[PDB]
């Protein structure tokens, strides 16, 4: 099974908990996995200027995800939704969901967050998407249940765990359903 | 695999949808189907004045839930939310949630709704108890690509078709899991 | 203003919730503040065994919900939602609904959580029905930190965090921000109705 | 009171419905409301391609949102969030959220869909947002039949239907219920704020 960890980083959060997904989707049998990032929106120019962490990840197509039996989402927490680069990813996605393309595949969602809630909100509300296009979501139940976080006021030790888990069980079930 | 209906209804249209998914699910080969509602809370004095339509299905227990592959949970639209007798079944699975009891099953929603507007938010505040569970979430994709719905300001055939879908979609995942 | 603190507790740590609402609501001259709670559902046996708080707070009726100028919520978490108390309370206000009675009212709410997960969804899906009765919803944001009366203190709402074995009780800095979030409703409950 | 109605639109189903919200808060004597849309992202050649529209409305800043004591957001549905380029321009307004400058300010919403489906999520997750910079939410519920002036007219802010393909305009009933909630936005901002 094909699995993928698309993920949208600017700071390095997510970027490093996209890492830790990968590795325990690598333990699994059978799990060809592979790690994307989806497109900086911003002039490279406003993104220094902020500060930026330049991503070096090999870039995503939106319709390249069709190719994944599994496809494990990660986003930064930016206001409880997702950021602005992976919603306009997500926005170029509609000549997949005309033809079905990702229909019955598995998803799955991370996030990173400061200490002010949201996480929970950026993780259901892109649930939201993945479900229009008729994917399978899995949540990681029992910190949420609906996915690894990384709450920052780099990842901790139990936040990189975690986020391992996920992917190795993402992967498994990926795996049982697709071989 | 095993396939548990759940429902509430009070004016029979979950009730009627319920029919129509248990038969869905029915036409996958080697699913065993079974439909159970949820107790009704209000005493039977209050039901009858509130012109209710008397359940006759098996009542389930909260804790025989844990006895199936897969879930396929019908609730009305209550103010956008699941009804008080879902919520109220639902907040006696503590015991399940910590045996880790449904983590990984199947779950799957459908809802009933006048023309409010609501029956959105209705599954997906329902997706959120089950991700509490551990429970992978099946959203039928592409009326809501969250769930079958039925709109009544008796259900029309078009919704009892998707209703069927859900159920053998749903099923059909379930036996491919557990055989 | 007439402002309402509803609530549901099982182990009273929404009910220590609801009396620093009200406190804090309390300080709005010209507010005048009532606490009450939904009507358990459970049996007495089994409440009494499970280990659940009796509390002397007056039960409320959905029908007086129609008096208030702003009605704030208090629910535990229970994965996600509010509670089956508060739920089948709410299911109850279909007259309400019909005849408009909490059009345009001012709503807010606040929970407590075991270990801290669903809180976020607990708040945001009791907004849901808020909304379908017209309500105006007001959330906590980030407030001024001088706003607080605890120095050094979610944006949807206050909250608290119990323990997983339900034995710790709410904090100071926690109780600060259900002083606060009263204190800031019933100055908007005041600023709209006198 | 200064009311912006900021949006986002593609194909214009939002921009009319923007028009209306602006309409109706315009009734409403001592409200000063001004339409803007948030910048496109696509570059111009893709959009034109695409059958995108052109606009006259003004390009908002994300600093200029400090100016109004009440923003009415438009977005499309896009799989049942709003837009990137709502959310792009909303990711934007850190510094406003640091400094507190849209905290207890009304906000409302409004979308668009094509075939009805995602556009509860789209509202209620904008709302989201809205609750991290301590906005005051405002829900439209089903208001009394007599406020809107279209006769025989979600609760969560106003909707249109685009069409499968796209070509539905909106509806005189559509529109109204977009009129109904720019005059009863606009009136609480005047309520607050004078
Ligand atoms: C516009 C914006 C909004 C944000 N909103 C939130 C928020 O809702 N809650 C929070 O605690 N942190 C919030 N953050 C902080 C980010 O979630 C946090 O810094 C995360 O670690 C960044 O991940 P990254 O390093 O992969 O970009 C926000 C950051 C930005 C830039
Ligand atoms: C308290 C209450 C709240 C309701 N809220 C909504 C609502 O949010 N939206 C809606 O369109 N219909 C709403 N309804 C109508 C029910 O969803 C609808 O009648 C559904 O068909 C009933 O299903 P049942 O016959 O299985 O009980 C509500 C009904 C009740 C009793
Ligand atoms: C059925 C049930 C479900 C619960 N779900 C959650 C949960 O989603 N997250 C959480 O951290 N705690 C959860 N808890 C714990 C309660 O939120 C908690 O102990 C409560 O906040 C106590 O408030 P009270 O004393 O006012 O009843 C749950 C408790 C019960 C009984
Ligand atoms: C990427 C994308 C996703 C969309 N998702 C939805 C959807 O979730 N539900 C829907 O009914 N229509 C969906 N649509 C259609 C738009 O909501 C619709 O045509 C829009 O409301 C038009 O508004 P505008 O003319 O202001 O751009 C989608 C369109 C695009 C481009």
Tied chains: 1, 2.
Excluded: C
């Excluded at 200027?49 to 599994?70: I, S």
């Excluded at 969602?109 to 400061?114: D, H, I, K, N, Q």
């Excluded at 909100?121 to 399978?136: D, E």
């Amino acid at each position: 099974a094909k699995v993928l960890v698309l993920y949208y980083s600017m700071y390095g959060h997510i970027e490093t908990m996209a890492r830790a997904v990968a590795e325990g989707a690598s333990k699994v049998d059978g799990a060809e996995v592979v790690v994307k990032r989806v497109p900086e929106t911003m002039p490279p120019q406003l993104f220094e200027k902020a500060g930026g962490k330049t991503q070096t990840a090999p870039v995503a197509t939106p319709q390249e995800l069709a190719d994944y039996d599994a496809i494990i989402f990660g986003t930064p927490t930016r206001f409880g939704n997702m950021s602005g680069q992976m919603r306009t990813f997500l926005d170029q996605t509609g000549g997949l969901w005309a033809s079905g393309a990702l229909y019955g595949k598995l998803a799955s969602v991370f996030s990173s967050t400061g200490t002010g809630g949201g996480q929970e909100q950026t993780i259901t509300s892109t649930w939201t998407t993945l479900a229009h296009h008729g994917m399978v979501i899995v949540p990681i139940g029992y910190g949420t249940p609906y996915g690894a976080t990384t709450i920052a006021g780099q990842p901790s030790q139990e936040e990189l765990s975690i986020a391992r888990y996920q992917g190795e069980y993402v992967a498994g079930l990926a795996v049982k359903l697709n071989g």
